[PDB]
Amino acid sequence: KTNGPSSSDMEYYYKSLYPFKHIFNWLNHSPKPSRDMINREFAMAFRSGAYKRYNSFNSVQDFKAQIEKANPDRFEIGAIYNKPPRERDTLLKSELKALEKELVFDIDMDDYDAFRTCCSGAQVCSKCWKFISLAMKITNTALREDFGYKDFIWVFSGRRGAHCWVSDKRARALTDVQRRNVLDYVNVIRDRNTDKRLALKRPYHPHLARSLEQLKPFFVSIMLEEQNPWEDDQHAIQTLLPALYDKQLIDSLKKYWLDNPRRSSKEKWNDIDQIATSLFKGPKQDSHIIKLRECKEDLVLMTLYPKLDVEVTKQTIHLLKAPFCIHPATGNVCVPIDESFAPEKAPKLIDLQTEMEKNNDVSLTALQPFINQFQAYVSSLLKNELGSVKREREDDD
Amino acid sequence: SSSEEEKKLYARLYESKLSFYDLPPQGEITLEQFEIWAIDRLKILLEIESCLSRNKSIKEIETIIKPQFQKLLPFNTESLEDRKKDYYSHFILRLCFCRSKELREKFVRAETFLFKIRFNMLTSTDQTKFVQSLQFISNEEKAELSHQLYQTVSASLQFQLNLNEEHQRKQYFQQEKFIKLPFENVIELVGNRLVFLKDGYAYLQQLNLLSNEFASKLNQELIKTYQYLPRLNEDDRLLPILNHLSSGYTDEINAQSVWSEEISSNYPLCIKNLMEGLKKNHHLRYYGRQQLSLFLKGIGLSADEALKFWSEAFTRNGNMTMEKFNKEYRYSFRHNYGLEGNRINYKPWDCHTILSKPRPGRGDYHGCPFRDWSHERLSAELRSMKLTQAQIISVLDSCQKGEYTIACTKVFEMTHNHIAHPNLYFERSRQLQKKQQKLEKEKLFNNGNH
Ligand code: SF4
């Protein structure tokens, strides 16, 4: 049992390691402090289980000092309010109105455990991280080409997930209805039950078809060989067969696999087509072939398409864990994610302490690349914010 | 304005057969024109509302309304008078319904549905001319995105325009134009994946967005008209018509047969209540006596049979002598029939005039039960009429919204298979009864030849 970081470890991380300035500049959207930070809600989770909401900081130093004094296990970022949330007790409950928050998406491994074999329970490795990687790829595809968003970044959840922070002025100002609309556009797999055929609407929406084409080359390499979940006959019956449309085909495949146990996922995938060809004959064979292809595509999407957490995105007032936070159980830093990121690459707080013992400087530790990446992202966001202000001024004239 | 200049402006406005009603009509119309056009458009909207409350399909509502269009508000005509009728009726109803929020909501909903129907009845060329009259994409941009746009819109085409063949769908798509707008304005269509999205822009289902913009603009203009109404309050001439229009949204028959079950099955619940009160108390107060007498006259009861009816009902308990009945009541009953005074043939009270009544107190039986009875008591008699619990719940939901006439129509329909008049209810029930009797007689005749 690897114990999580101690309270003294959290104090050390907060006093010497947290990139407080970069987070402040990211959330402030301006080099100078503004109401985007003074009126931002922050919620702090303590080791005792206490949860204190509606905290706010006026400056860079105030943020660092309050976080150091509180020493929470983690803290979460809220929306911009019309009034400082820290002054809530002097205000009526109806006076604090949320006005802006970054669009947020949460993806976890929990919805993919039915299709992975390289890890069990709450474990994670590079093999299963391909699910999250494809999820970010598809989500970024949608956000970039369909919504026109530019300033978004992915951050490791700490154990096996990732959070998306869309900081576009258009995305930040979305109402709850608009956020629900974007989520429903992205959340194709509404029913996560693997024991039932999706029966997705046909013809595919261009986003759905594009995602299917993007995911098709990876379906073999991941599912049929690396994970190989349908080698087990019981797992095959539980997850692969229910995605088929024809009862006769399902029964025939079940009997064939009972007579020939432990056929691998690729072999079962080919058996589906072979038995379907043997069964469906005559002038109606083309419809059966088309329906089988549709079911196979639906299973590809069920197995590889992003499975978002739908609550966190719906409302402007929802709180989400801030980046660079320490995961209490693993000690991993919630670092930003690039194309080469894997869960084993996230620095651990104890390792950062060991590095700081040799070199008492954050710039010489393993946390530094992620800090640099975040700083570049913040700089680009600020440049785009200035451009948007100029465009608004031009439009008003 | 010269008549010629007025016609020129109106033609510039109607370049399309459909309008957003952006600019106020200019010109003078007579009071008869004012009230008649207002009442005709109001009837069209009320029929729309009645169809909607019954969950009728769009095609059924269109089919019902087309003859009403040809009769009351002719559309797709080149006559300037019909277009003037539509425009002035719309703006008169704007004046009528701007007073209250609920009236505004009902008006904008009905008017948006009317807009939808009218747009659906237009030709595709006329629809294109109207939408051209919200930036359209160039043909090059359509060609670049043609595959994605066709994939998005193929299902909408198949299910809305019944273009089952792929060739017809492609041929229509080649002629279809698309509008590029931010997805925030069409988030509703984005949710159902009916519109193509690229770089934050939604490519358009156009009827839905057009209806949404029309409803928003109509809401705003109603608000402005409500702000400007008190300046119009100085016109003594229009106020009564506006008030009436706003509130408008809310020997077989003789003295003995009117009590019989054959005739008693046909009355509406108000009339049954008044007759039950008369039977129990052998007396009805002024408003109840007036309502009952005018109904009875409207259903065919002559004056002499009315006098016999009233005398027999009143003298049954012995508390009233015939001398007192002749001294106090005979004159009023004859007057109701136009036999006394100025000989004015009083018309029977519709639902609206009954509701304009002053609320029944203790001992009163007049008014409308659906407005004046408690929910438990109404449930009691509706159970007595062999209505199911779901039907009773629907009727009570209609009563709670203030749609008492809607609930009257509902109880009519459940007990027999839009009514705004007791005599209309009686007449429809009588016609259905005679039709059923004729069908039964025909069945008996057919079963006797085998
Ligand atoms: S809705 Fe009209 S006809 Fe029906 S019971 Fe009420 S007042 Fe009588």
Return d(Cα B257, Cα A53) in angstroms, integer. 77
Determine, for residues B187 and A149 on separate chains, whether the beta-carbon distance falls below 8 Å. Answer: no
Q: Please state, in angstroms and as integers, the Cα–Cα distance from residue B274 to each residue in B261, B286, B414, B425, following that order.
A: 15, 12, 22, 16
Residue in the structure block whose two tokens are 């107190």: B361
Backbone angles phi, psi at A152, to 5 degrees: -135, 150
Query: What number does the ligand 1 atom closest to the CA of B422 have?
Result: 3
Contact A295, A272 (CB under 8 A): no
Annotate B180-232 with DSSP letters as a single string: EEEGGGGHHHHHTT-SEEETTEEE--HHHHHHHHHHHHHHHHHHHHHHHHHHH
CA B48 from chain centre, in angstroms, equals 6
Return d(Cα A173, Cα A100) in angstroms, integer. 5
Return d(Cα B153, Cα B194) in angstroms, integer. 7
Return d(Cα B34, Cα B28) in angstroms, integer. 10
Return d(Cα A344, Cα B70) in angstroms, integer. 75
Peptide bond connecting A203 to the previous residue in cis, omega within 30 degrees of 0: yes
Contact A40, A80 (CB under 8 A): yes
Handedness of CA B232, B235, B240, B241 (dihedral sign): negative
Q: Which has the closest alpha carbon to A321: A77, A155, A80? A: A77
Cα end-to-end distance, chain A, whole Å: 64
Which residues, other chains included, contact A195 with Cβ-Cβ below 8 Å and sequence gap of 6+?
A238, A239, A242
Q: Considering CB atoms only, which of B148, B155, B197 is closest to A147?
A: B197
Minimal C-alpha gap between A341 and chain B (Å): 27
Just list the catalytic residues of A.
41, 106, 108
Chain B partners within 8 Å of A145 (Cβ): 198-199
Residue in the structure block whose two tokens are 């959840």: A157
| DSSP helix/strand/coil, A81 | strand
B154 at interface of A, judged by CB pairs closer than 8 A = yes
Q: Where are the domains of chain A?
A: 1-397
Which residues, other chains included, contact A23 with Cβ-Cβ below 8 Å and sequence gap of 6+?
A63, A322, A323, A324
Which residues, other chains included, contact A167 with Cβ-Cβ below 8 Å and sequence gap of 6+?
A26, A29, A102, A151, A152, A153, A381
Residue B338 Cα to ligand 1 middle (Å): 25
Beta-strand relationship, A162-166 and A152-156: antiparallel
Chain B partners within 8 Å of A209 (Cβ): 151
Backbone angles phi, psi at A122, to 5 degrees: -95, 15
Return d(Cα A72, Cα A61) in angstroms, integer. 17
- Residues A202-237 as b or e (16 or more Cβ within 10 Å = b): eebbbbbebbbeebeebbeebbbebbbbbbebebbb
Minimal C-alpha gap between B220 and chain A (Å): 21
- Which pair of structure tokens corresponds to residue A336? 């930003």
A195 at interface of B, judged by CB pairs closer than 8 A = no
| DSSP helix/strand/coil, B328 | helix
- Element of type H or E holding A154: strand A152-156
* Residue numbers preceding breaks in chain B (C to N > 2.5 A): 133, 204, 250, 417
Return d(Cα A226, Cα A238) in angstroms, integer. 19
Return d(Cα A294, Cα A279) in angstroms, integer. 17
Return d(Cα B223, Cα B391) in angstroms, integer. 37
B205 at interface of A, judged by CB pairs closer than 8 A = no
- Element of type H or E holding B280: helix B269-281
- In this structure, the number of other CB atoms found within 10 A of the CB of residue B244 comes to 15
3-state helix, strand, coil in chain A (%, to 5): 55, 10, 35
Contact B253, B263 (CB under 8 A): yes
Determine, for residues A207 and B193 on separate chains, whether the beta-carbon distance falls below 8 Å. Answer: yes
Beta-strand relationship, B201-203 and A320-321: unpaired
Give the number of residues written for chain A.
397
- Which pair of structure tokens corresponds to residue A377? 């992202």
Beta-strand relationship, B201-203 and B196-198: antiparallel
- Which pair of structure tokens corresponds to residue B130? 């109207």
B201 at interface of A, judged by CB pairs closer than 8 A = yes
CB-count exposure of residue A69 (10 Å: 0-12, 13-18, 19+):
exposed
- Resolution in angstroms, to 1 decimal, for this deposition? 3.7
Chain A partners within 8 Å of B159 (Cβ): none
Minimal C-alpha gap between A144 and chain B (Å): 7
Pocket of ligand 1 (CB under 6 A): B 268-270, 351, 354, 368-370, 404-405, 408, 422, 425
B190 at interface of A, judged by CB pairs closer than 8 A = yes
Which residues, other chains included, contact B385 with Cβ-Cβ below 8 Å and sequence gap of 6+?
B411, B415
Q: Which has the closest alpha carbon to A335: A361, A380, A367? A: A367
Determine, for residues A205 and B199 on separate chains, whether the beta-carbon distance falls below 8 Å. Answer: no
Residue in the structure block whose two tokens are 């073999």: A220
- Residues A5-40 as b or e (16 or more Cβ within 10 Å = b): beeebbebbbeebbbbebbbbbbbbeeebebebbbb
Contacts 24+ apart (CB under 8 A), A342-349: A342/A126, A342/A129, A343/A124, A343/A125, A343/A126, A343/A129, A343/A156, A343/A159, A343/A160, A344/A125, A344/A126, A346/A156, A346/A158, A349/A5, A349/A9, A349/A13, A349/A17
Technique behind this structure? Answer: cryo-EM
